[PDB]
């Protein structure tokens, strides 16, 4: 009972580590918002180009 | 009962549920570029 309540807490700890991984791909400055950005704009200085 | 064991079972309260985290990006906005002064130079137009 003792090593399946260890065994739980090793997935509370994975868990927080996956929302930790997740929190660093929202703040990090290359994210998915700076590219989608960049394509928005490129896509009009090209067509105008 | 007579040994002193309940006749009567006990009550199970409920565990509380593993909550889900949540994360946020907050963002920024700095200003933009303002254009600067500009000056006249000497060459003419395809040189500069």
Redesign the interface.
Same mark, same amino acid.
């Given at each position: 009972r003792e090593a399946a309540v260890l065994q739980k807490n090793y997935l509370?700890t994975q868990? $927080?580590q996956t =929302?930790a991984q997740? $929190?660093f791909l =929202?703040?990090k400055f290359s994210?998915a918002?700076l590219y989608n950005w960049l394509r928005g704009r490129l896509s009009a200085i090209y067509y105008q180009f | 009962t007579i040994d002193g064991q309940p006749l009567s079972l006990s009550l199970y309260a409920t565990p509380a549920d593993?909550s889900m985290?949540l994360?946020?990006?907050i963002?920024a906005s700095q200003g933009g570029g303002d254009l600067p002064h500009a000056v006249m130079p000497m060459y003419r137009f395809p040189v500069i």
């Open positions: 509370e868990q $927080a =929302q997740l $929190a =929202q703040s994210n918002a | 593993p985290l994360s946020a990006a963002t």
